[PDB]
Amino acid sequence: AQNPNCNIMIFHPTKEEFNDFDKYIAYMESQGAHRAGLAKIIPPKEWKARETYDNISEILIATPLQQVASGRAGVFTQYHKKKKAMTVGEYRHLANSKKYQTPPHQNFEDLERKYWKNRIYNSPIYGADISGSLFDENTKQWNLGHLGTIQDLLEKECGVVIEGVNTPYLYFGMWKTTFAWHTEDMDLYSINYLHLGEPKTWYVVPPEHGQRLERLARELFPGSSRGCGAFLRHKVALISPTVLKENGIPFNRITQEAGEFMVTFPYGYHAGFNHGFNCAEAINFATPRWIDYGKMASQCSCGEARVTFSMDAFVRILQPERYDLWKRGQD
Ligand SMILES: O=C(O)CNC(=O)C(=O)O
Numbered sequence: 001a002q003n004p005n006c007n008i009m010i011f012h013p014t015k016e017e018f019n020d021f022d023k024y025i026a027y028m029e030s031q032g033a034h035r036a037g038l039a040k041i042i043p044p045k046e047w048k049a050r051e052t053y054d055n056i057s058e059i060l061i062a063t064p065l066q067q068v069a070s071g072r073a074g075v076f077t078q079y080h081k082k083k084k085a086m087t088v089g090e091y092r093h094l095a096n097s098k099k100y101q102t103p104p105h106q107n108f109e110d111l112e113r114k115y116w117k118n119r120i121y122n123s124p125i126y127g128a129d130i131s132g133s134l135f136d137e138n139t140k141q142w143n144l145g146h147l148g149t150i151q152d153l154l155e156k157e158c159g160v161v162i163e164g165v166n167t168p169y170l171y172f173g174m175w176k177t178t179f180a181w182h183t184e185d186m187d188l189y190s191i192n193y194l195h196l197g198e199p200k201t202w203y204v205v206p207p208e209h210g211q212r213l214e215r216l217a218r219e220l221f222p223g224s225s226r227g228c229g230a231f232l233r234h235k236v237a238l239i240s241p242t243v244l245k246e247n248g249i250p251f252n253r254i255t256q257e258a259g260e261f262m263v264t265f266p267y268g269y270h271a272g273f274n275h276g277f278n279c280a281e282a283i284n285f286a287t288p289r290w291i292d293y294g295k296m297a298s299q300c301s302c303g304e305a306r307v308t309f310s311m312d313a314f315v316r317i318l319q320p321e322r323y324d325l326w327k328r329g330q331d
Pocket residue numbers: 171178179190191192264270280282283
């Protein structure tokens with residue numbers, strides 16, 4: 001078995017190897033990359049996502065989210081308070097302000113220490129989940145707005161023809177902006193490209209051990225657990241590496257820098273934070289190996305997780321028993 005310790009793997013495809021996206025994903029899995037839940041892909045030196053970022057300040061963040069924390073430094077939840085719209089130019093200036101900027105630090109480890117020590121005492125503002133793309137249309141390789149769709153994968157593998165679309169989303173981050181512990185909708189893959197700015201630190205639990213993280217989360221967030229049988233779908237809970245180590249949960253960590261891709265694999269729980277002002281683009285995708293994960297994915301039916309139009313069809317076809325109850329939650 002390849003990668004039996006479930007380490008995060010880092011790939012350096014050549015420009016030739018970067019032509020066929022599906023083939024490269026299948027290659028990485030042949031080497032065991034999926035066992036980690038997360039992989040890094042460094043693009044060939046010749047590749048570029050677009051020519052410059054020189055004109056991005058005019059993108060609108062219609063609903064910036066202030067991420068307010070509750071709990072203790074290592075075990076907290078966050079709630080998203082909606083703020084007034086602002087442009088990316090306004091948000092970047094805010095991120096660079098004295099109130100919100102990255103503190104002085106020695107290296108990524110010192111910054112990680114400061115994040116876990118101090119996150120809860122601040123409320124950074126995150127521009128999340130903004131439909132759009134920063135890939136140039138002329139970028140033919142690993143262009144996250146040109147991937148094969150999940151609906152087309154389900155049709156090729158299973159013959160079924162469904163409604164729905166699959167488009168990318170932009171994320172504008174600042175110091176301390178945080179992504180809570182989650183897997184993807186329907187336990188899909190994700191791919192995330194850091195277009196510019198400061199790094200993103202990731203934490204990940206191997207898929208084969210995801211239930212260990214779930215059981216700890218039920219112990220640490222016991223009222224949330226009684227409220228919903230899949231409350232990590234709410235994407236609000238944080239647990240620090242120190243707490244994960246104290247409780248024996250297997251995990252890995254890695255820092256993504258500008259110009260790099262990350263892939264998350266089906267049922268790979270992940271969480272993380274931004275080091276400073278940045279912009280990422282991410283989208284869900286599927287392969288044949290996902291189908292079985294989609295069939296087994298948990299679902300939030302309490303009504304809090306409230307997800308896309310396109311997820312309806314996935315539930316309806318892969319999980320017809322759940323359909324009914326999950327749509328009671330979504331209506
Ligand atoms: O970058 C972020 O804030 C969160 N992204 C993801 O969880 C992802 O790409 O799957």
